[PDB]
């Protein structure tokens, strides 16, 4: 009947990952920026950027999606020293966004992994899950996840969703520019607020 | 409207975990049994047993749920030697089931982790998710997961679901006996088939 896998995938993504990772994020980014400012006179944005390609195409390397999205460094962990608070090994990567080979921006960036599940499901024949179903569930994942963060205790403030449909008329996208767009708007806000 | 997180949680559990772990399971259990037979003259069942406590109570140690469910050993990995096939570090534990301090059975056993998500959601007030909602979604998780394995290419044959509601009239359960029940029925089948 009313089957919507995106509901559980979004809730699970929030409860089992974002809720755990986001509280400590700002401090880990600050404590890295004290050095990144000193070294390269740059600054890493404080929000986790989440890629949500509506086509559910998740590469295992970001740079293969865009040579202007370049791995810079690993974001180090939290400092409390037993169990965690919820500091375990989650790897978070910092990327520099390029324009003409020059650095135009810098952020912690990653794909929302539950879209891989939607892709794998569309390739699993016994699921009866078409590419049109997949797209519909991708959009519903985004909207569900958005609603969740709207009522979340500044988990909202800790991350930014970047959903995008790509040309099937098949110009190339610029993911780096889409991301750069968000980073610049974010800085505008932080400085006019 | 029709909100059912259990659908995505079950699909995600199957696609992102069970589908990957189950194909190699029998061989890893055989290749361990060649030794376990030789050592203790015992035998580890070939099916992955999945605990689905409908109360969504997942302890981080099985023996705290039952002193008659005792950790025996780690099941070693697959043998192919780069990337995986999908052999990564997933830890699978072998437990001996006890009766009067004696070994009555032996199996790879674990909790279906997505029930933790349902528990965490019931404790998250902004989710508007009651304990009655949680129970309803636990049952729906089980049924959804069952239907999936029914059409699965002997993923069905590789695992066994053990769902249980516990006394709220509050006698104690015996989880070890519930599990032992399944192991004995499984052996009966294997030997009458
Ligand atoms: Ca793509
Ligand atoms: Ca329990």
UniProtKB/Swiss-Prot annotation, chains A, B:
Domains as described in the record: In absence of cGAMP, the transmembrane and cytoplasmic regions interact to form an integrated, domain-swapped dimeric assembly. In absence of cyclic nucleotide (c-di-GMP or cGAMP), the protein is autoinhibited by an intramolecular interaction between the cyclic dinucleotide-binding domain (CBD) and the C-terminal tail (CTT). Following cGAMP-binding, the cyclic dinucleotide-binding domain (CBD) is closed, leading to a 180 degrees rotation of the CBD domain relative to the transmembrane domain.
Impact noted for substituting residue 8 to S/V: Partially constitutively active mutant that promotes the production of type I interferon in absence of cGAMP ligand
Residues the record lists as binding 2',3'-cGAMP: 12, 17, 88, 113
Phosphoserine modified-residue sites: 91
Effect of residue 80 to I: Renders the enzyme sensitive to 5,6-dimethylxanthenone 4-acetic acid (DMXAA) drug, leading to activation of the STING1 pathway
Binding-site list for 2',3'-cUAMP: 17, 88, 113
Note: The cGAS-STING signaling pathway drives sterile inflammation leading to type I interferon immunopathology in severe COVID-19 disease caused by SARS-CoV-2 virus infection. Tissue damages in the lung and skin lesions are caused by activation of the cGAS-STING signaling leading to aberrant inflammation. Endothelial cell damage is also caused by activation of the cGAS-STING pathway: SARS-CoV-2 infection triggers mitochondrial DNA release into the cytosol.
Top-level taxon of the source organism: Eukaryota
Disease listed for this protein: STING-associated vasculopathy, infantile-onset: An autoinflammatory disease characterized by early-onset systemic inflammation and cutaneous vasculopathy, resulting in severe skin lesions. Violaceous, scaling lesions of fingers, toes, nose, cheeks and ears progress to acral necrosis in most of the patients. Some patients have severe interstitial lung disease.
Keywords: Autophagy, Cell membrane, Cytoplasm, Cytoplasmic vesicle, Disease variant, Endoplasmic reticulum, Golgi apparatus, Host-virus interaction, Immunity, Innate immunity, Ion channel, Ion transport, Isopeptide bond, Lipoprotein, Membrane, Mitochondrion, Mitochondrion outer membrane, Nucleotide-binding, Palmitate, Phosphoprotein, Transmembrane, Transmembrane helix, Transport, Ubl conjugation
Gene giving rise to this polypeptide: STING1
Regulation of its activity: Activated upon binding to the hydrolysis-resistant 2'3'-cG(s)A(s)MP, an analog of cGAMP, in which phosphodiester linkages are replaced by phosphothioate linkages. In contrast to mouse protein, not activated by anticancer molecule 5,6-dimethylxanthenone 4-acetic acid (DMXAA).
Organism of derivation: Homo sapiens (Human)
Outcome (variant: residue 117 to A): Strong decrease in c-di-GMP-binding
Annotated protein name in UniProt: Stimulator of interferon genes protein
Phosphothreonine carried by residues: 79
Effect on the protein of changing residue 5 to M: In SAVI; constitutively active mutant that promotes the production of type I interferon in absence of cGAMP ligand
Mutagenesis / variant outcome for changing residue 90 to S: Strong decrease in c-di-GMP-binding
Major site of localization recorded for this protein: endoplasmic reticulum
Subunit text: Homotetramer; in presence of cyclic nucleotide (c-di-GMP or cGAMP), forms tetramers and higher-order oligomers through side-by-side packing. Interacts (when phosphorylated) with IRF3; following activation and phosphorylation on the pLxIS motif by TBK1, recruits IRF3. Interacts with RIGI, MAVS and SSR2. Interacts with RNF5 and TRIM56. Interacts with TBK1; when homodimer, leading to subsequent production of IFN-beta. (Microbial infection) Interacts with human papillomavirus (HPV) protein E7.
Tissue expression remark: Ubiquitously expressed. Expressed in skin endothelial cells, alveolar type 2 pneumocytes, bronchial epithelium and alveolar macrophages.
Effect of residue 8 to E: Abolished homodimerization and activation
Subcellular location: Endoplasmic reticulum membrane; Cytoplasm, Perinuclear region; Endoplasmic reticulum-Golgi intermediate compartment membrane; Golgi apparatus membrane
Cytoplasmic side: 1-193
Gene Ontology biological process: activation of innate immune response; antiviral innate immune response; autophagosome assembly; cellular response to exogenous dsRNA; cellular response to interferon-beta; cGAS/STING signaling pathway; cytoplasmic pattern recognition receptor signaling pathway; defense response to virus
């Amino acid at each position: 009947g009313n089957f919507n896998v995106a509901h559980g995938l979004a809730w699970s993504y929030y409860i089992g990952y974002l809720r755990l990772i986001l509280p400590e994020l700002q401090a880990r980014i600050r404590t890295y920026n004290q050095h990144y400012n000193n070294l390269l006179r740059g600054a890493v944005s404080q929000r986790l950027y989440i890629l949500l390609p509506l086509d559910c195409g998740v590469p295992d390397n970001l740079s293969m999606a865009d040579p202007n999205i370049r791995f810079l460094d690993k974001l180090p962990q939290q400092t409390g020293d037993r169990a965690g608070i919820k500091d375990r090994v989650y790897s978070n990567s910092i990327y520099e966004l390029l324009e003409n080979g020059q650095r135009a921006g810098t952020c912690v960036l990653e794909y929302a992994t539950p879209l891989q599940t939607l892709f794998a499901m569309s390739q699993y024949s016994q699921a009866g899950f078409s590419r049109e179903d997949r797209l519909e569930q991708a959009k519903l994942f985004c909207r569900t996840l958005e609603d969740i963060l709207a009522d979340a205790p500044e988990s909202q403030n800790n991350c930014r969703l970047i959903a995008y449909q790509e040309p099937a008329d098949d110009s190339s996208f610029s993911l780096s520019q889409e991301v750069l767009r968000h980073l610049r708007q974010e800085e505008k806000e932080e400085v006019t607020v």
